[PDB]
Amino acid sequence: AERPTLPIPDLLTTDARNRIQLTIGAGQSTFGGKTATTWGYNGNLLGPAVKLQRGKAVTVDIYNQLTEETTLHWHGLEVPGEVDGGPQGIIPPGGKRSVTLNVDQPAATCWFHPHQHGKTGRQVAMGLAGLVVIEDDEILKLMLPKQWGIDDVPVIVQDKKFSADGQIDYQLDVMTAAVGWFGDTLLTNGAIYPQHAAPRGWLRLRLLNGCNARSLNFATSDNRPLYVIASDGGLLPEPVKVSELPVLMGERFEVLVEVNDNKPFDLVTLPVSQMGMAIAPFDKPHPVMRIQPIAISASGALPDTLSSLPALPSLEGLTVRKLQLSMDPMLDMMGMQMLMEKYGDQAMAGMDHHMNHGGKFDFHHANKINGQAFDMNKPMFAAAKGQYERWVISGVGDMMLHPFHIHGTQFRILSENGKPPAAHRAGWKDTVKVEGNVSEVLVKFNHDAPKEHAYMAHSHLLEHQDTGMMLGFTVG
Ligand SMILES: [Cu+2]
Ligand SMILES: [Cu+2]
Ligand SMILES: [Cu+2]
Ligand SMILES: [O]
Numbered sequence: 001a002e003r004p005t006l007p008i009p010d011l012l013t014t015d016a017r018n019r020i021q022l023t024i025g026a027g028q029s030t031f032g033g034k035t036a037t038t039w040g041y042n043g044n045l046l047g048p049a050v051k052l053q054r055g056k057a058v059t060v061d062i063y064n065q066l067t068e069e070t071t072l073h074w075h076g077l078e079v080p081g082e083v084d085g086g087p088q089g090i091i092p093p094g095g096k097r098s099v100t101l102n103v104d105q106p107a108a109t110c111w112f113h114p115h116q117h118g119k120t121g122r123q124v125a126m127g128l129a130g131l132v133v134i135e136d137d138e139i140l141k142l143m144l145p146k147q148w149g150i151d152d153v154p155v156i157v158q159d160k161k162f163s164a165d166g167q168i169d170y171q172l173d174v175m176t177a178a179v180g181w182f183g184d185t186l187l188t189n190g191a192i193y194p195q196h197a198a199p200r201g202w203l204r205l206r207l208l209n210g211c212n213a214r215s216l217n218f219a220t221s222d223n224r225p226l227y228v229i230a231s232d233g234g235l236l237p238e239p240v241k242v243s244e245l246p247v248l249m250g251e252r253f254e255v256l257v258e259v260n261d262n263k264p265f266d267l268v269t270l271p272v273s274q275m276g277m278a279i280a281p282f283d284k285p286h287p288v289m290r291i292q293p294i295a296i297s298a299s300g301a302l303p304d305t306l307s308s309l310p311a312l313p314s315l316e317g318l319t320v321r322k323l324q325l326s327m328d329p330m331l332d333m334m335g336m337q338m339l340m341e342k343y344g345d346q347a348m349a350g351m352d353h354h355m356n357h358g359g360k361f362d363f364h365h366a367n368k369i370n371g372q373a374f375d376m377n378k379p380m381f382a383a384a385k386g387q388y389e390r391w392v393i394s395g396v397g398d399m400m401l402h403p404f405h406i407h408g409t410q411f412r413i414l415s416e417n418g419k420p421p422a423a424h425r426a427g428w429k430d431t432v433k434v435e436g437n438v439s440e441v442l443v444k445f446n447h448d449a450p451k452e453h454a455y456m457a458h459s460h461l462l463e464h465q466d467t468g469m470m471l472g473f474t475v476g
Pocket of ligand 4: 073075405460
């Protein structure tokens with residue numbers, strides 16, 4: 001069989017009432033010829049790409065047609081807490097909530113997904129995620145590849161695992177609360193190993209790691225380079241050439257890659273050094289999509305300069321906030337031993353060389369920040385508005401991967417896990433790696449968040465977030 005074409009999310013803009021309609025519902029998808037119940041926005045799986053323009057407001061009407069509560073968070077978008085869609089932004093089953101987004105940040109590829117309390121991992125695993133394309137006046141003057149679905153394509157990469165009857169097999173239990181939910185099947189915009197036909201010249205890929213727990217590392221099958229032009233929060237100052245591109249859960253990068261006649265190539269993901277993530281078929285480079293060149297000229301450019309990146313300010317006198325992540329040692333050991341028992345030594349490939357005792361021992365609140373599992377009723381602190389702060393996030397104490405995400409901002413990384421950030425990670429970010437070490441980021445919050453609709457800060461390894469590794473904070 002030929003490969004299926006890469007599905008392209010619809011690019012959605014407002015109506016004359018300046019509204020975008022999103023319906024959240026359950027439907028059916030097919031994977032490897034077996035049907036599965038899946039959830040989507042405006043469809044059965046995944047979602048559209050909502051297009052936003054800096055300095056323009058849009059209203060989004062969100063209809064929850066599931067039979068359980070959900071929320072909708074705009075990951076990467078800087079909006080007041082009242083419309084941020086964290087766990088307090090409940091949408092009742094069968095109900096509607098509307099939000100007005102006043103877009104006030106540079107061009108970037110952001111995304112949106114559920115943030116239901118304690119259930120975010122399951123609702124993402126069932127299929128809910130969408131995209132956000134922010135444009136501004138500056139980016140259009142660059143004349144980047146811009147034909148949506150032709151030379152400008154989103155690539156949402158996610159793993160799933162399925163039970164024998166075809167259904168998605170999601171369980172939040174001691175082992176996945178320890179190591180994360182991961183599977184053996186890789187999806188690219190919902191499809192297994194699709195092909196994308198691209199014109200000759202530059203192809204722009206907007207990459208999103210939409211996995212619950214798996215980190216990825218993109219490369220090409222014939223070692224042609226990727227030119228990074230943008231990170232989570234928008235353009236870099238100039239392109240950064242890379243041979244491989246690590247992407248943590250919830251992160252985005254946009255890259256340009258050359259397309260040459262007669263020479264198809266794959267986008268692949270290379271094995272990572274993360275517990276559990278190098279079990280077959282991920283013990284070897286794994287294709288994500290085939291790029292099929294078409295002998296029609298692509299008109300996009302890769303300019304020498306993309307944007308201006310301001311200097312870091314002086315750090316003296318800035319408020320320093322400490323965020324100590326932690327896991328329960330007993331439950332970490334129990335979950336890691338179940339992983340080893342199931343898959344054996346391969347569950348640590350690439351790494352450096354039973355009774356009920358009550359609620360005190362419940363894994364659902366085993367993961368914590370500053371000694372507390374997420375308490376929706378008690379924001380941990382009140383951050384300053386319009387002031388830079390230095391947030392120091394420590395994973396010392398365990399060796400699991402914590403891609404740490406802060407709502408309400410695009411920050412600058414000062415230290416990523418004990419080293420200055422790589423050049424393609426030195427621009428605007430909303431995620432920073434923490435793994436066995438300490439990171440420090442420079443953040444500023446331009447919008448208010450009250451206690452009733454607080455901003456979240458958490459690990460984007462969803463099973464850890466859902467089992468307590470999140471805090472709430474207010475701004476203003
Ligand atoms: Cu997110
Ligand atoms: Cu977010
Ligand atoms: Cu979040
Ligand atoms: O998130």
